[PDB]
Symmetry: C5
Subunit: 209 residues, 5 copies
């Protein structure tokens, strides 16, 4: 029976923040899911939007695993003590402003969960934001330097409440949110990079009828 | 015969800033209490507020205790040399801007006290801010990754003037501040995260 | 008997930045004085001002003294190598923006001087700024975690012209500056905290 | 064999981030190509633009190479663990804002690849941005401290769509982009610094 | 023969970043010359100007010199591995924004050169900026903690095109620039601090 102090200790040794946990030669399965929390600055003229969302990220790193039959099977670890996916938002025009503590959750089986609350600005289609159908902003997130053979991002598509955690005090209301998996290759190079395309459909609230 | 130099050296030798000081399977009891110092910006249309407040935070970490019968029973320590609760404002739309030196106070009995002055923007109910009844902005502060079995958060509900340290130079005034213990559970997982619900009742000054 | 490289070497070998240089058991005498350089942005509606000033900070650290009979009696040192008072502006609404190199001047007798140029925004009485009597903005600076028995702050009773280094290109002009010593206590805790209350009376330049 | 960890451990072990990987006294062949992703702020009065581009930079560091006959031939590495060309946008008026993970790609032959997405503001000709001819903003990128003998910069001449990865939601559109190799020289010294002069022909998307 | 790696290492193992490289008692002779590259945010009401310039800074450290008969006679070295003059713009109202790689240049003879391109806001005379005579903004740069005995600054007095590198796309133009040597003392202290007073005479471009 070991305590949390040891669990972190053994992790800080078997872990490599800059080494992708590629088991055998299969890519790392990275699950990416966003939970829109608020929509703030929207400019239909420039087509830019400021969003706040919880980026639920999940992946596995066996090396971290440990016996929890008589010990804690989950601990909070600083992301800098672990390896994390170099995920990026392709159409982002500002760097992610992480608002919460940068701690990840690690389970004795190696499963890793990281869910930061992020404030970021995007360049997307904002036209129709002040119309009934609303506007649909597409966010593309995926690894930046790890192609499909190294990292495979897949959205945890599961019928959930889109505006479930959305601020009721927002000026906008969520009409719908669909998250589709996609892949991007580049004419120069053979490898392709997987990504998740999150489509955010929203409109202004209190519009005349 | 110990001194401040030694008290610190010891904390360095025993403190595990990245490991929650959990005794047995008993969650670390964290006490949180906000003290509104100022309200800088308020948007009646976007329901957003920019405020300044002291966030009094307390918890125990016996592994840092020491005999103070022959030396100071308290010293200032950089929070980076100590474990700190990963508290967060669930409804904050900006990262916390700490305006004060990031030092905590550690008492010979292991008691830890951290009270930084913070400026932060939040998303809450601003309606009625211009009336006599004022608005009620509710702020939720609780652990971000540690649940009830690991961390517990209870407000320091006592008697004092809600606006006892509030700038008299603000455009607003505090009518009342109430802080209650709350809980947050997410649809996916049974685990629950304790938090403190801070309700700020304020209105614009000079209710014409 | 030595060079500047030796002096600095010893300082790093004996100095402990996270330990206040308490001599015996008496509080560390920290002297604080502000020499206003500019008044940039002002808002009489929100009662906020942006200010640039030199925060002349002084105190003593005996654990750094050295024989200078045949060696330099003074050297510039990175504040990150020395212990520095955890001063703060109580009514500041933005963290201090240090504009100058963060080097302190250490004397062979243990005297330490740190005078950074700082730009910071404060919440204070800006009313009457466009009048003849002008406005009086009071700035309060004192230790954040060290109470009176650990740190005492007092203004340098040295005389000098207030708008001496004040930019003549500022839209405003300094009418007077009084730096009073003060103490604060909190209904929760016995210990009190010292601070220097700097009242800056200024106004928008008129004409004729 | 040699898993990714062995390679990364080796690179970390042999990498000299502060030394230029000069084969003989041949300068280092650095290639840079900009992929304009968006044009955000544009001011024809001040001749200032805010652009987002992927600055594809490539060079070689033979000392990093390793045998990949039965091991990974490419890995992602933090640029902090590698030497990087000290490129600068001569006509930039803001420090480069890297929006992506600062990781490069290292190939078993020593080929280093780094392609950050950068948002930056430049001072260039903006006049005509509203006409059909559009405006022609020219950006000059090159080493800042290393001249032609130490570092050479050549554009990856490869006919591809200029606005291939240009946001369709931008108020502007790309007319044509030319990345010509150029050079610079300062009146003082003979040393000439190689650069890449990128001419961006863009205009505001009219009503369509 | 020595490669760049051996040169750097010798430098690193003998440079003292926090120790002023004094020779005997004499002061370290630092040369400061500014090359205005652009003028941006200008305000005659607030008397503030935004300016971009190259701050060519030169000094020597003979302890770093080496034999370059058959080895590189110059190398680029990170300013963090070397001691750098703690220069500061006395009338700057914003911290300096360094737009370029923070790399210095060390010559085999001990000469050290550092020329960062800096963007920074200043408080100076802006009156008449829209007149024919234009305006004259005076920038004062010089050591912050080192007095005349430890550091001395000499303006690079040499006939050269003032707007040689000045942006043509700027909304303003340089009428003339003068870099004189100045000295400063404070009623408290006998020592003086040398500096270089740069007087930029510019105006708003027009058509005639
Ligand atoms: O399951 N959840 O939705 N959890 C959740 N939403 C907001 C905060 N939170 C708890 C949590 C759980 C795990 C990690 Cl790594 N961070 C945060
Ligand atoms: O109890 N208090 O309200 N204390 C208090 N308010 C402003 C400054 N201050 C002193 C203090 C006490 C303890 C810590 Cl960790 N930080 C600061
Ligand atoms: O005595 N002074 O007023 N000194 C002073 N005013 C502006 C700059 N300066 C020099 C100085 C002296 C000592 C230190 Cl630690 N920093 C700066
Ligand atoms: O060739 N590309 O255009 N590649 C590319 N564009 C966006 C992301 N990406 C992949 C990539 C691969 C390697 C490096 Cl060092 N940077 C980026
Ligand atoms: O004017 N110059 O001699 N050189 C120069 N101007 C802008 C860039 N540059 C090259 C250079 C030369 C030396 C150093 Cl330390 N940095 C940069």
């Amino acid at each position: 029976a070991a305590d949390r102090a040891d669990i972190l200790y053994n992790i800080r040794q078997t872990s490599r923040p800059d080494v992708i946990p590629t088991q055998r030669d299969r890519p790392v399965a990275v699950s990416v899911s966003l939970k829109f929390i608020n929509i703030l600055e929207v400019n239909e003229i420039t087509n830019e939007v400021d969003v706040v969302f919880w980026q639920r990220t999940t992946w596995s790193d066996r090396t971290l695993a440990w016996d929890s039959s008589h010990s804690p099977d989950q601990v909070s670890v600083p992301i800098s003590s672990l390896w994390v996916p170099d995920l990026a938002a392709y159409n982002a025009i500002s760097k992610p402003e992480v608002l919460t503590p940068q701690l990840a959750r690690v389970v004795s089986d190696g499963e890793v969960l990281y869910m930061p609350s992020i404030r970021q600005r995007f360049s997307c289609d904002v036209s129709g934001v002040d119309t009934e159908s609303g506007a649909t902003c597409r966010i593309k997130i995926g690894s930046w330097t790890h192609h499909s053979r190294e990292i495979s991002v897949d959205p945890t598509t599961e019928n959930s409440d889109d505006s479930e955690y959305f601020s009721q005090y927002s000026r906008f209301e969520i009409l719908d949110v669909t998250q589709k998996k996609n892949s991007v290759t580049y004419s120069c190079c053979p490898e392709a990079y997987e990504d998740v395309e999150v489509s955010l459909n929203f409109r202004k609230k209190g519009r005349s009828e």
